[PDB]
Amino acid sequence: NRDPASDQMKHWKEQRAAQKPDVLTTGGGNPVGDKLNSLTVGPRGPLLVQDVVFTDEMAHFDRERIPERVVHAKGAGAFGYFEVTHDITRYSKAKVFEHIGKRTPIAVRFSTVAGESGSADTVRDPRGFAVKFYTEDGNWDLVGNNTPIFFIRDALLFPSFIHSQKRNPQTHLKDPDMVWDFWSLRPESLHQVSFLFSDRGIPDGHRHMDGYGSHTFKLVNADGEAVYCKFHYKTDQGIKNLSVEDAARLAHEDPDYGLRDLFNAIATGNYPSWTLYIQVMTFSEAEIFPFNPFDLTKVWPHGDYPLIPVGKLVLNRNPVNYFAEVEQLAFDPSNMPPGIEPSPDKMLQGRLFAYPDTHRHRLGPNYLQIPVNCPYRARVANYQRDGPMCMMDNQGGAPNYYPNSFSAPEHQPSALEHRTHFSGDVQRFNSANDDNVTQVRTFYLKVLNEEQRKRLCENIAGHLKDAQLFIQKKAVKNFSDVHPEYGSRIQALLDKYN
Amino acid sequence: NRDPASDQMKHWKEQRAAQKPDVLTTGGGNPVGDKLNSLTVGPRGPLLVQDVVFTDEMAHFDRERIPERVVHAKGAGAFGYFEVTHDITRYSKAKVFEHIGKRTPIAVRFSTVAGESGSADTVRDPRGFAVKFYTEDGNWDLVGNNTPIFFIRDALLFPSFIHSQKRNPQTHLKDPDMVWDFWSLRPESLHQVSFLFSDRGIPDGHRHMDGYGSHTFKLVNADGEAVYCKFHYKTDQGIKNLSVEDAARLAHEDPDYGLRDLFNAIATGNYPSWTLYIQVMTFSEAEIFPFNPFDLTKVWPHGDYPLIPVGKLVLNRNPVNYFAEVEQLAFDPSNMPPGIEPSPDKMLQGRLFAYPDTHRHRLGPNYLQIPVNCPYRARVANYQRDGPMCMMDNQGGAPNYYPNSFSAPEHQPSALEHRTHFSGDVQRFNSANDDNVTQVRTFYLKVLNEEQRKRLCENIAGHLKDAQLFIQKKAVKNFSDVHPEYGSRIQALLDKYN
Amino acid sequence: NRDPASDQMKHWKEQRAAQKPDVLTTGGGNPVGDKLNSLTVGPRGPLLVQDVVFTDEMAHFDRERIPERVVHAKGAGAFGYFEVTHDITRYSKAKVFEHIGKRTPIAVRFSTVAGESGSADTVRDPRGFAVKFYTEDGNWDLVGNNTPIFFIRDALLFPSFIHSQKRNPQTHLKDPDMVWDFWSLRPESLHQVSFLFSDRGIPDGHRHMDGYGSHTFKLVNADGEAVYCKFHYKTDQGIKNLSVEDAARLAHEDPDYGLRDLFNAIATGNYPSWTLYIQVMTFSEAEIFPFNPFDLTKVWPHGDYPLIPVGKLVLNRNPVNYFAEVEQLAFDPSNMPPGIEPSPDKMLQGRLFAYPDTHRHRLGPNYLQIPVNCPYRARVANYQRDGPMCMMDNQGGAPNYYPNSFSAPEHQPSALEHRTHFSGDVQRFNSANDDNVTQVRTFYLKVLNEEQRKRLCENIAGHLKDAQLFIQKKAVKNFSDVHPEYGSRIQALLDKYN
Amino acid sequence: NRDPASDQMKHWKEQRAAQKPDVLTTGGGNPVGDKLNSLTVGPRGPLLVQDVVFTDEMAHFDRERIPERVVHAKGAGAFGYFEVTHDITRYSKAKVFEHIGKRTPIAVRFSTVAGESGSADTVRDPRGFAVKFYTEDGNWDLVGNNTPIFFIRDALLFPSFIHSQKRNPQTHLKDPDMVWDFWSLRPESLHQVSFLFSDRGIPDGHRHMDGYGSHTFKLVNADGEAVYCKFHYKTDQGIKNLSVEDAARLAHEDPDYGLRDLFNAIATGNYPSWTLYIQVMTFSEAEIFPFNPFDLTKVWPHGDYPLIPVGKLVLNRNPVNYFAEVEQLAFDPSNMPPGIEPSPDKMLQGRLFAYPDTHRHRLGPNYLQIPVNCPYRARVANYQRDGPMCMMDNQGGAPNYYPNSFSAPEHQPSALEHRTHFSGDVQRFNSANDDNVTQVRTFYLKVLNEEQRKRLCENIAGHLKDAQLFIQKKAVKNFSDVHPEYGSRIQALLDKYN
Ligand code: HEM
């Protein structure tokens, strides 16, 4: 026959022999007599306002669309479980990790970053890989990317970043002057631009890319003892990327390639897994790391900070409804249950605010009562009330002020955050001159071969070539700065294009 | 001790011996350590963006308020049951009425009409008395008033009506020029203005007023046989009104008088009931009624159209949460289950549209999934999908187009509306000159005594007195038109004020 | 150099020698000191809540996206003028047409129909061609398509139609079972499916397709005299379509092909025009047309109803801001100024309601104050007040009720709609069995050659081939019904695919 | 005649002799023929969906209401000017203060705190007194109260505070158990509870109360030199309070008393003014003040910190439209132009976030483009784009990313915030045991007479009397703690009530 994505209504149906279709209703639950013909006066007369079946249905249609995600708009989702397989209780007191063999439910959305909702899956772009955990200490969202780093170290430059990756305000076209204006003007961006224009620029579907936490977290054990960490969830399927020729074909041939693939795997019993690892950095090694340990354009070298296994991530259930379980999923970085905690990472500190900020806009004030976003494995008790589309019982008649003499919920000291000491001037510190090339240099000399170096250059120039020459000029200087051949392998190509 | 309204937290508490308060969480379900002290650097330092407990909670606070109702903003609610006690199956095939002794669940909101949310209960104003029925054929809402008529016969004049009852666009004050400008300029308004300034202008709480459907419905039996009807739900408690002296005191002494009373009745076991009656008018008597049978400024005389009993309305359960079960209740006139159906009543035809229109604005696109507004006694199956704050499973993976070969819901012919014949020119027919006084005249001569006539005059002038004299002049002419003493009992008083 | 789309920031800049950049502010208008570095305690400390520059900017970012259009989501816009060139004042009293040589300003959005915002321009799909006119009698929107017909004759089937053209509720993929389930089950759809899979399925950009009003309007002259009409705006550029091979390339090579082209034309001085024609049908010819004159699956034959010239449509100004002048443009069918007026067309009667319905959702209650949607060539005076994001002066302190003694705006009798007579039973009339093939048959025998017939078959099957065989079976029967060779040229191909 | 509030439409009219009312339109600008009669088939037929005049108008009605303010919901506004009259340029480099005689435009909303929109003006409650300044360095909002202190020192307790001042979640009534539960459980609240139940609990209208900044700001001169400050704007009209007997009468007699008065003053030429003063506290006196200088339950004694004059606040223009210029005014604390700057005040630090947070909810993402909220005296240039109801030109085609090579706006170093040093542990510091009585004690012994002390007791108990006795018990202990007679003057009264 065909692939399961395709046999969907076929199966929805096959699955009801206990048929006799339900009665077609309005949303008030009133049964409908004819839903194929509006109510008129005479067969060629006008439409009655009394056709409250027409307006019910139409009124709902005209209201189906919610704003798409400001970034990472296009994606795929699925459900499965995280299972502990080693213990790190030394490091963390978090329930999710509390005992080998433990399983917590998880949801996952894969996505690209700049394309809007009808774009093609198979484009060079970073790739979102978000994991929501339904722990007993509430949800813990780990909003990762398939890259261990990023383009920038200060959240303040993010709007701009993204603006320049999107489209011209006048033209609505993608503009290389904007792409390359930004990047060349901010070379802290070289580390990841180097990751992006390499073979991993475009994964073969979601199942063949790694997920990284990128940021540095802080893990706190049951004694008050803290350490810094990095999460890596590696693919059990391997790395597999699509050549750029392969990607052009599929972008037209199957814009949704990655959704189809993810659906089909799971459907046929071929469940993707990823192994979750943590690198750990004590507070002292942190005082000596030759770089800012909290700098998103930086990785922690594995000879120095070897990876430690934590458990597995298995994806084994497809959505029944996309809209309701993938379009409405809201991942917040700030959803950290006791034992996990943010670091001074400038980029992380702004994600603390942004995610819930846009969730209240896109979805609504109360988007945490959306079945899928509900910490259902825990028990919510607080003094928050009311607000639009308030679904639950709104916590009944329980005292809504704190504190009170009437047995309403109480705070629990064992959940206090970890005491840490900060001294300094309230000022805005430059970070543009932190080291922009070392790690980059090595990446290009020792992490990537010669084929790859020839490739990462052609791909780069293949795009760069369309900015204005000034922009080229500056772009290449920066490249030149990371390694002289990086620079002039690129100029060579650019010359020949130009 | 005190009244139950007052012993509320006292009881909420008493009711948990199985105490040990719940753990105070964030909305993600993460447990909180200190909710009385924000996170700072040093005890006199600044507030960290990392206090994602502060912003969670605050973010929810700043979002608690939804727009209040455009009219009827202030009110009380409660739950109970409708029970059949006589059969009218001759007249109607509606399930709610299907068999003596049948009980359907109902909700009820009482309200005033012009005051905004913090106004006083005990003011002269019409009074909303809405009943939502959770029938098997979906919800059936009967959005009635405590008056059998209204001020106007064309929905097009409603915005204006209401604008003039509210406040000045510049001043934000209540303006008698606007009240009396409108009313005197539109004398179709005399019938109800006469009801409003009489002793029934202000009921003693909700429990001592009648509820009326006002409009003319159409009842259709199991044979295709139709008749026109009027619903009357009379108080089993009696009529009881508060003198205007009593009402001034309470407006300051207890702005919420009616909420307190309704709460307290039910709480102490004193359950209000109302007997529901129907007047019936055949299609032929309709062709001969000396007035427009479908004219909201008109009642059907009971010697001519005696009342027929239908069942009882008992209120026996108070809300646990006001916000969630009274502020979020949405009554739509258009929620008529098979066997009940609108008439050509101009005022009714516009309510068909307006209620769901503002419900999608105030509450949201999907306000019918709000637990209390859900036709829970029925089964919703249709082709509507998606939309903001989409709570259910969004009907899964079931075919979303109609028609289809895949067993998705189907329409049911037995729910077709009733065939009726209309012939005419598509035009806008005046209705301002329909009879504006007869029924009014009688009302004032034979329905109300002498005490009452002396009273309805003083009350009228007591307010009228503050418009400009032109407005008075016209106001009184109109009154003069309904009965010469109506007019000059009023001028007499106005002279003495002026 | 390069194409003007591309030299945009280059020109924005070149255009300011009167430079010295403005001071970068917050939205409160407070000047910013460093917008590249957040405010922290110590260079490696945490982010202060006092960085109200961070949250201002971020808060705005997280809120940039509004829901996209339920259909026709992806598009291009531009401004220009309509100019009268012949007079039809016999037919219409509309100011826009009042005198040869008259020019009214117009805006225009081109779009596809099913793809979401990041889709490819160059796909087989109908094509929106909307024209907003800023007349003195208010705006007149003519929301046309590049096709004179459509798939369905009853608005009630539209949600479904569209649902089946979009994506599976479970899978989020495009599903041929849904495409072909619908269409084969509703053969009234054959007329336009035949237009769609022919060479005009994909125009070469927007400039080389015709625009049609599709529906039948009613034109009313200065005497009260009415006639029925059809609007046709033909391209002065010619017809030009892209082969399907050409379209695949460009869908990947330049998803935005049509935006780029429209931008570039106008930018370089190559202004597209279209000639507007009207077919006219008297009320009597309407009583005899061998079909329902008001049936969207039907054209009025030009030998019978020759076209009459009206004026020209010239596009000569590109947007400065896409978001603000193309994403926020709202076209409402119901925006008909005196002299133009809807017919009993079932599809038209539902568009009366739907457009403003979704505009109040997507844009907001007051989306008619969005500069571009403002009838700026007229003067708005009414009794509507208040509402969210109320921009103007809200009409000051002017009486807000109607009628009134205080000189507030008044209605004008000369704008009454045209008296017309309707007689019949209030019922829901089938329309599925109206003639589904004749016009189709001719189309295929005499309107299209042999090359074209060979092509329209291959294209059809080329897609059809992926439904389940039942669906094929039914699809082909229908085709067989319109002409036996239509049917079996298709079966032949399908056999060879299958 | 009568008061100007009352002669409003009378004047609106009188003011147009250049009459001939405008033509009544729809919002598309289409002229209306009959707005008093809907469109039907036959004079007693049903309502046509083609009455797109009905739905336009109705659709707008059903959408008029926006959520009211979470607190301070009910109020009055007006416009005028701030004028410099002494120089404090030593202290501050802010343009508003730049030179004696300077005048900046200002807006002002007065309000109460707990009542919802239809409540009575003349109730015991704190009183909002907000001032928006349209300076050249953007708007500077000074969101003050008529009290120099408040009930709490940590924003985290605010939701709760407010919850307990409002109504029961079950009952919707005002509950003294909640009022007095909170307050007695948090005695830091004694300072202001003492202010609130004294004669200043209820001002005689807005014109006879002082305005205070309450919080401690930081003033920074042109050298980088900082100092801490407190703003006091004293009434030039004097203090005048209404007895509680007077207030009961007016609450029923004229719920809007304060709006009427403010309107009428200004209208008749009687312009209220207030003199603005600043107390200054060097960073060193701050290191020695025997209390937390940044503690909202604390004033800075004037013998120690004498007041220094700054300029005058004159109110001289009433709104034309209330909705558009008072309901839609949005004051943000965070709107501080260079030279003014927040302190470590915990309560202030949370207001930084909250105001704009709820403005984006109530009004919308872009509420700063609402004419009245627009920093019109400055020039907004930034990288923020798009968002719902985006009114301006959205800044055209100007580069939307930062930084860029294309002359788009730039940041200005002279606007950097003031360098300050903080050292400490990231922890949550208690503040409940800071001194809760001293200042209170004095207040009651030396600031208030004997009449007043007898009064402040009766008023207190007069309300307290309705909590449960436990609550009383604790309440009085606290009072006892501030002065033994405070406590037992109260017990005496409570005994006699009880
Ligand atoms: C053209 C005529 C009328 C129109 C368009 C209209 C419109 C409205 C609107 C927009 C609301 C607010 C509902 C909400 O926001 O949830 C409302 C409330 C209400 N109306 Fe009407 N109104 C009309 C006349 C009447 C009449 C004649 C009655 C009495 C039979 C009535 C009874 C009510 C009641 C009881 C409520 C409050 C519902 C509740 O308690 O939730 N109205 N109306």
Three-class DSSP labels, chain B: CCCHHHHHHHHHHHCCCCCCCCECECCCCCECCCCCCCCEECCCCCEECCCCCHHHHHHHHCCCCCCCCCCCCCEEEEEEEEEECCCCCCCCCCHHHCCCCCEEEEEEEEECCCCCCCCCCCCCCCCEEEEEEEEECEEEEEEEECCCCCCCCCHHHHHHHHHCCCECCCCCCECHHHHHHHHHHCHHHHHHHHHHCCHHHCECCHHHCCEECCCCEEEECCCCCEEEEEEEEEECCCCCECCHHHHHHHHHHCCCHHHHHHHHHHHHCCCCEEEEEEEEECHHHHCCCCCCCCCCCCCCCCCCCCCEEEEEEEEEECCCCHHHHHHCCCCCCCCCCCCEEECCCHHHHHHHHHHHHHHHHHCCCCCCCCHHHCCCCCCCCCCCCCCCCCCCCCCCCCCCCCCCCCCCCECCHHHCCCCCEEEEEEECCCCCCCCCCHHHHHHHHHHCCCHHHHHHHHHHHHHHCCCCHHHHHHHHHHHHHHCHHHHHHHHHHHHHHC
Buried b vs exposed e over B331-350: b needs ≥16 C-beta within 10 Å?
bbbbbbbbbbbbbbbbbbbb
Contact D422 B173 (CB under 8 A): no
Alpha carbons A364 and A358: distance in angstroms, whole number: 9
Pocket of ligand 1 contains residue B356 by CB under 6 Å? no
Q: Is A407 helix (H, G, I), strand (E, B) or coil?
A: coil
User: B43, D429 in Cβ contact below 8 A?
Assistant: yes
User: C384, D57 in Cβ contact below 8 A?
Assistant: yes
DSSP A408: -
What residues contact B64, with CB distance under 8 A and at least 6 apart?
Answer: A385, A386, A387, D70
Residue with tokens 């508003």: D96
CA-B215 nearest atom, ligand 1: 30
Burial class (CB in 10 A: 0-12, 13-18, 19+), B245: exposed
Q: Is D128 helix (H, G, I), strand (E, B) or coil?
A: strand
Nearest CA-CA partner of C430 in A39, B402, B338: A39
Torsion (CA) C82, C86, C87, C93 in degrees, nearest 10: -10
**Residue C49 identity:** V
CA-B213 nearest atom, ligand 1: 30
Nearest CA-CA partner of A79 in A319, A311, A276, A256: A319
Strand segments (E) across A125-210: 128-135, 138-145
Alpha carbons C342 and D47: distance in angstroms, whole number: 16
Alpha carbons B196 and B443: distance in angstroms, whole number: 12
User: B242, B260 in Cβ contact below 8 A?
Assistant: no
Buried b vs exposed e over C216-240: b needs ≥16 C-beta within 10 Å?
bbbbbbeeeebbbbbbbbbbebeee
Alpha carbons D294 and D316: distance in angstroms, whole number: 34
What are the angstrom distances between the C-alpha of D271 and each of C490, D108, D112, D120? 85, 13, 21, 24
What residues contact C333, with CB distance under 8 A and at least 6 apart?
Answer: C141, C143, C342, C348, C351, C352, C355
B-chain residues near C472 (CB < 8 A): none
What are the angstrom distances between the C-alpha of D298 and each of B151, B456, B469? 56, 57, 56
CA-B350 nearest atom, ligand 1: 1
Residue with tokens 């985006």: D390
User: Taking a contact as any Cβ pair under 8 Å apart, which residues of chain C between 36 and 75 contact chain B?
Assistant: 41, 45-51
Contact B380 A31 (CB under 8 A): no
H/E segment holding residue A233: strand A226-235
The C-alpha angle D94, D99, D104, rounded to 5 degrees, equals: 70
Count of CA atoms in the C-beta half-sphere (13 A) of B53: 28
B-chain residues near D119 (CB < 8 A): 118-119, 255
User: C97, C308 in Cβ contact below 8 A?
Assistant: no
What are the angstrom distances between the C-alpha of A379 and each of A390, A402, B28? 17, 18, 10
User: A39, A54 in Cβ contact below 8 A?
Assistant: yes
Q: DSSP string covering A234-284, please?
A: EESS---B--HHHHHHHHHH-TTHHHHHHHHHHHHT---EEEEEEEEE-HH
Phi/psi at B313 (nearest 5 deg)?
A: -125, 105
Alpha carbons A225 and A227: distance in angstroms, whole number: 7
DSSP C380: -
User: A289, A281 in Cβ contact below 8 A?
Assistant: yes
Contact C58 A154 (CB under 8 A): no
Q: Is C456 helix (H, G, I), strand (E, B) or coil?
A: helix
Annotated active-site residue in C30, C37, C60, C72:
C72
Looking at the partner chain, which of B401, B424, B428 has a beta carbon nearest the beta carbon of C178?
A: B401
User: C50, C39 in Cβ contact below 8 A?
Assistant: yes
First to last CA, chain C: 50
Q: Is the peptide bond before B290 cis (omega within 30 degrees of 0)?
A: no
Pocket of ligand 1 contains residue B350 by CB under 6 Å? yes
User: D304, D57 in Cβ contact below 8 A?
Assistant: no
Q: Measured in angstroms, how far is the CA atom of residue B71 from the centroid of ligand 1?
A: 7
What residues contact B262, with CB distance under 8 A and at least 6 apart?
Answer: B76, B78, B110, B205, B206, B207, B272, B315, B318
Annotated active-site residue in B1, B60, B145, B241:
B145
User: C73, C304 in Cβ contact below 8 A?
Assistant: no
Alpha carbons C22 and D381: distance in angstroms, whole number: 6
Alpha carbons B45 and C50: distance in angstroms, whole number: 11
**Chain C contact for A259, CB < 8 A?**
yes
User: A438, A301 in Cβ contact below 8 A?
Assistant: no
Alpha carbons B427 and B425: distance in angstroms, whole number: 6
Handedness of CA B300, B301, B303, B304 (dihedral sign): negative
User: C208, C239 in Cβ contact below 8 A?
Assistant: yes
Pocket of ligand 1 contains residue B377 by CB under 6 Å? no
Nearest CA-CA partner of A235 in A265, A257, A194: A265
**Residue D139 identity:** N
Instruction: Answer yes or no: C145 catalytic.
Output: yes
Q: Is C475 helix (H, G, I), strand (E, B) or coil?
A: helix
D-chain residues near B429 (CB < 8 A): 37, 40, 42-43
**Residue B252 identity:** H
Contact B117 D120 (CB under 8 A): no
Alpha helical stretches, state H, D30-126: 54-61
**Chain C contact for B432, CB < 8 A?**
no
What residues contact D435, with CB distance under 8 A and at least 6 apart?
Answer: D291
Pocket of ligand 1 contains residue B111 by CB under 6 Å? yes
- Ordered domains of chain D (ranges, CATH): 1-65 (4.10.91.20), 66-149+201-374 (2.40.180.10), 150-200+436-498 (1.20.1370.60)
C127: which 2 tokens?
A: 């094509």
H/E segment holding residue C138: strand C138-145
Angle between helices B54-61 and D346-362 (to 10 degrees): 40
Q: DSSP string covering D2-33, please?
A: --GGGGHHHHHHHT-SS-SPPBPB-TTSPBPS
**Chain A contact for D157, CB < 8 A?**
yes
Find the length of chain D: 498
What are the angstrom distances between the C-alpha of C44 and each of A424, A429, A430, B334, C11? 9, 9, 11, 62, 41
B contact chains, 3+ CB pairs < 8 A: A, C, D
Q: Which residue of C has its CA nearest to D415?
A: C33
What are the angstrom distances between the C-alpha of D321 and each of B19, C394, D61, D77? 53, 7, 17, 10
D-chain residues near A422 (CB < 8 A): 422-426
Nearest CA-CA partner of B183 in B490, B496, B497, B460: B460
Contact A407 B13 (CB under 8 A): yes
Alpha carbons B60 and A356: distance in angstroms, whole number: 11
Alpha carbons D353 and C212: distance in angstroms, whole number: 52
Best mutation target among A57, A357, A386 (most B Cβ atoms within 10 Å) is A386
Alpha carbons C324 and A241: distance in angstroms, whole number: 39
First to last CA, chain B: 50
Strand segments (E) across A328-375: 340-342
Alpha carbons D76 and A274: distance in angstroms, whole number: 61
Specify which residues B141 forms β-bridges with.
Answer: B132
**Residue B317 identity:** R
Task: Return the number of other C-beta atoms located less than 10 Å from residue C114's C-beta.
Answer: 20
Q: Are strands A128-135 and A211-212 parallel, antiparallel or unpaired?
A: unpaired
Best mutation target among C56, C179, C402 (most B Cβ atoms within 10 Å) is C402
Specify which residues A128 forms β-bridges with.
Answer: A111, A145
Looking at the partner chain, which of D169, D185, D425 has a beta carbon nearest the beta carbon of A420?
A: D425
Strand segments (E) across A54-120: 75-84, 103-111
CA-B347 nearest atom, ligand 1: 1
User: B136, B376 in Cβ contact below 8 A?
Assistant: no
Phi/psi at D474 (nearest 5 deg)?
A: -60, -55
What are the angstrom distances between the C-alpha of D87 and each of C490, D84, D304, D311? 90, 7, 21, 9
User: C124, C132 in Cβ contact below 8 A?
Assistant: no
Task: Return the number of other C-beta atoms located less than 10 Å from residue B433's C-beta.
Answer: 7
Report how far Cα A487 is from the mean position of its chain's Cα atoms: 32
Contact D422 B354 (CB under 8 A): no
Alpha carbons A115 and D345: distance in angstroms, whole number: 43
DSSP C48: B
Handedness of CA B258, B260, B262, B264 (dihedral sign): negative
Mutating to test ligand 1, I would choose from B68, B72, B163 the residue with most ligand atoms within 8 A of its C-beta, which is B72
* Rg for chain B, CA atoms, rounded: 26
Residue with tokens 């409108």: B182
State the resolution, in angstroms.
2.5
The C-alpha angle C36, C41, C47, rounded to 5 degrees, equals: 60
**Chain A contact for B381, CB < 8 A?**
yes
Alpha carbons A245 and B352: distance in angstroms, whole number: 58
Residue with tokens 């105070």: B24
H/E segment holding residue A54: helix A54-61
Nearest CA-CA partner of C75 in C139, C11, C125: C125
CA-D58 nearest atom, ligand 1: 5
**Residue C283 identity:** F
Q: In what order do the strands lie in the sheet with D40-41?
A: A40-41, C421-427, B421-427, D40-41
Task: Return the number of other C-beta atoms located less than 10 Å from residue A283's C-beta.
Answer: 13
Contact D21 C409 (CB under 8 A): yes
Tell which phi-psi region holds residue C281, choosing left (phi > 0), alpha (psi between -120 and 50) or beta. beta
Mutating to test ligand 1, I would choose from B66, B69, B149 the residue with most ligand atoms within 8 A of its C-beta, which is B69
Residue D201 Cα, gap to closest chain B Cα (Å): 17
What residues contact B434, with CB distance under 8 A and at least 6 apart?
Answer: B153, B188, B291, B292, B295, B297
Alpha carbons B53 and C358: distance in angstroms, whole number: 37
Q: Which residue of D has its CA nearest to C408?
A: D21
Report how far Cα D238 is from the mean position of its chain's Cα atoms: 20
Specify which residues D300 forms β-bridges with.
Answer: none
Mutating to test ligand 1, I would choose from D56, D62, D63 the residue with most ligand atoms within 8 A of its C-beta, which is D62
C301: which 2 tokens?
A: 């034959």
Residue C14 Cα, gap to closest chain A Cα (Å): 14
CA-B145 nearest atom, ligand 1: 29
Q: Is A103 helix (H, G, I), strand (E, B) or coil?
A: strand
User: D297, D188 in Cβ contact below 8 A?
Assistant: yes
C-chain residues near B160 (CB < 8 A): 383, 400-403
Three-state DSSP string of D422-488: EEEEEECCCCCCCCCCHHHHHHHHHHCCCHHHHHHHHHHHHHHCCCCHHHHHHHHHHHHHHCHHHHH
H/E segment holding residue D141: strand D138-145
User: D186, A405 in Cβ contact below 8 A?
Assistant: no
What are the angstrom distances between the C-alpha of D164 and each of A401, B118, D160, D167, D180? 6, 16, 6, 7, 9
User: B307, B278 in Cβ contact below 8 A?
Assistant: yes
Torsion (CA) D315, D319, D320, D323 in degrees, nearest 10: 170
Q: In what order do the strands lie in the sheet with C40-41?
A: B40-41, D421-427, A421-427, C40-41
Residue D432 Cα, gap to closest chain A Cα (Å): 12
D contact chains, 3+ CB pairs < 8 A: A, B, C
Number of C:D CB contacts under 8 A?
A: 353
A-chain residues near D406 (CB < 8 A): 181
